[PDB]
Amino acid sequence: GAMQNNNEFKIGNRSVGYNHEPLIICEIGINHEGSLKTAFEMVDAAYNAGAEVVKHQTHIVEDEMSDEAKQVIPGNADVSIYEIMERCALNEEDEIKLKEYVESKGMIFISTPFSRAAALRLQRMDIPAYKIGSGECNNYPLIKLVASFGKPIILSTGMNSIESIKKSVEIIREAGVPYALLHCTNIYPTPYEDVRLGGMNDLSEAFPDAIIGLSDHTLDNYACLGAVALGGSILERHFTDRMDRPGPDIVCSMNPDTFKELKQGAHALKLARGGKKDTIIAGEKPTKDFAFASVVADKDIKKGELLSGDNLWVKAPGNGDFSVNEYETLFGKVAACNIRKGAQIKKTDIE
Amino acid sequence: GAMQNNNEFKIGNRSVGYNHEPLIICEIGINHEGSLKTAFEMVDAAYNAGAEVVKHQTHIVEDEMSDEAKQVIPGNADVSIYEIMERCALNEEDEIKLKEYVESKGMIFISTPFSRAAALRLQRMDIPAYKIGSGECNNYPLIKLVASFGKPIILSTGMNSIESIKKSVEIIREAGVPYALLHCTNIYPTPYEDVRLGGMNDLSEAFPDAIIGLSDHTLDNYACLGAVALGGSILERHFTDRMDRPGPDIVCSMNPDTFKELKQGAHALKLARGGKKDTIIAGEKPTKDFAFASVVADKDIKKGELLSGDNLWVKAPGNGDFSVNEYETLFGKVAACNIRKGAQIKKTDIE
Numbered sequence A, B: 001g002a003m004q005n006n007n008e009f010k011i012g013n014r015s016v017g018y019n020h021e022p023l024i025i026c027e028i029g030i031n032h033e034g035s036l037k038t039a040f041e042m043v044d045a046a047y048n049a050g051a052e053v054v055k056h057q058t059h060i061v062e063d064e065m066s067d068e069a070k071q072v073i074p075g076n077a078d079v080s081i082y083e084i085m086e087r088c089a090l091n092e093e094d095e096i097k098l099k100e101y102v103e104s105k106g107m108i109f110i111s112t113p114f115s116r117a118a119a120l121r122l123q124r125m126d127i128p129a130y131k132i133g134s135g136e137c138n139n140y141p142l143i144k145l146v147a148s149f150g151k152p153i154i155l156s157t158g159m160n161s162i163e164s165i166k167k168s169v170e171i172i173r174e175a176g177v178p179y180a181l182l183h184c185t186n187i188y189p190t191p192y193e194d195v196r197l198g199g200m201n202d203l204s205e206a207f208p209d210a211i212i213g214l215s216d217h218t219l220d221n222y223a224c225l226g227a228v229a230l231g232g233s234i235l236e237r238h239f240t241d242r243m244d245r246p247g248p249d250i251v252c253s254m255n256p257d258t259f260k261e262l263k264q265g266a267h268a269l270k271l272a273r274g275g276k277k278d279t280i281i282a283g284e285k286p287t288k289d290f291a292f293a294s295v296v297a298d299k300d301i302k303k304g305e306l307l308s309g310d311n312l313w314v315k316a317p318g319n320g321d322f323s324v325n326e327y328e329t330l331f332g333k334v335a336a337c338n339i340r341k342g343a344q345i346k347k348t349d350i351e
Ligand SMILES: [Mn+2]
Pocket: A027, A217, A238
């Protein structure tokens, strides 16, 4: 039940929450490999595919990592995280041009700051909402800074327990900004078996004021579609204009075609999800009228004979005086006239 | 939580339940339009597509409907239900040949009896499990007969409230047979908005011993995929060898290609569904090691100076002596030596 709720906030003019259309975040991330030309090509592909939001990563290497980062390699690469981020990072001027380009296509630009310096850059740019990546979910000092900007926060929760996340949510609530929690697994790519969609329920139950979604790094749309069925309001996958691009995140990115498929599926499952079993569906009425059973004579019954389980049965359609629900209530009734085998039992057939 | 359970039973050698691979029932139904040749063509298409189960409908018109049925038209047709069933019904000899053909392809044959006579025919054939359609979900006399055969029952629950279904489940439990409940909406085709996947949860909560699934009549796989994400164990769609076939149910049927897509998606979502947020994923360890923050000097600190929020900050990677969680614990500590701006704070750097 927890995920079926009225929680909502706006990112600019776009309302997100269970009662709204799911929102797909196209995470270009570092997929541009440091090139504004490639980034624009990817923004073009997102726009033409029907995207509403393009998300960036804001990398200021000096403030985001210490020299130790030069000695440590990610699971999906063979060089240091420092080398990757130095290679892919857009400087401030280029990132400002990227935000302008995204907005010139009528889409929303948001980003993930990976540092204090990055957070401050985005505040100067006045972005409408902040994403906090799973690597920074336990970075309470950074979250406190970002929350002070007064914009909604979308918090990815991979690599963190509910217990760890509580401290971040406390900081966010204290700042008085609305927020979303995205369930996430940070393996690039993520196997289906590690997704644990049930994590979304767990988050929603622990944090009843949270908007809930999924950030994903599997190779396809199945996990995100499943998330929508569960009640997810925000979906995030990395995004590329084409799958032959180089880069460590390309492998789990969606492309224009698969984005379009996700948007279509998300809409269908937004419509199909939730609701209640007992809700009466007007469209079924012709089916109920022909398919439901009425009580019929199973033998010729003479006037004055007793109705029973031996001489009554039930058959479609549902327009007879007695429904199958009343079948046993007729036992012991007296035939008021001769009753023909196969005929519906009428109220006038009994005394 | 209700749908995440250990409930199970077998249909022949095939185990069904939340902890098993989802089972897709290929409901040929009346799609053969009364022709054994067409029925065999459809069985061939199901086999070659990878189907495990072919489901029939067993129609003995005299016992399933009274003469009133000649005056009533289904929502998805323009002739009487009587005319449709008389046209499509396979006689006993032909239905026996159909069961043999399905089994000769190594698939399981089950069927839905729409009458007492049909139920008795299937008992003579010794089918491994019985399906009860939504039109018969409130046909308590028929359910009592079928349950007496001692085989598992798969009960569709469209057009019926939880209250109505309780009476059928009582009968089933009394007979001592295991059972599944399929959530269902009986409009042909069903709009996404009428699916109400939440109905599955409602059933599971009301009937905690039930295996739970979805029977569907939408135009595509989205609803069934959503059902798998929720914990569904049995999926049913009508099945045709090709979509250009005539017949009132063809429109919402899956074909070989879309069956294959559903089977693939059902497997992915069987893997991805459920689980817990706090579960530790071994594969994320390299990400945690590079991405998590450690405490660093934010200024040159001279020996004897106090550590504080002004001269400390936090940065990746996660191999420093102090985690971001310990950031505030260092406030007021005394520098045991000169500490260089940007360096990780070490245990030997404090008194
Ligand atoms: Mn990511």
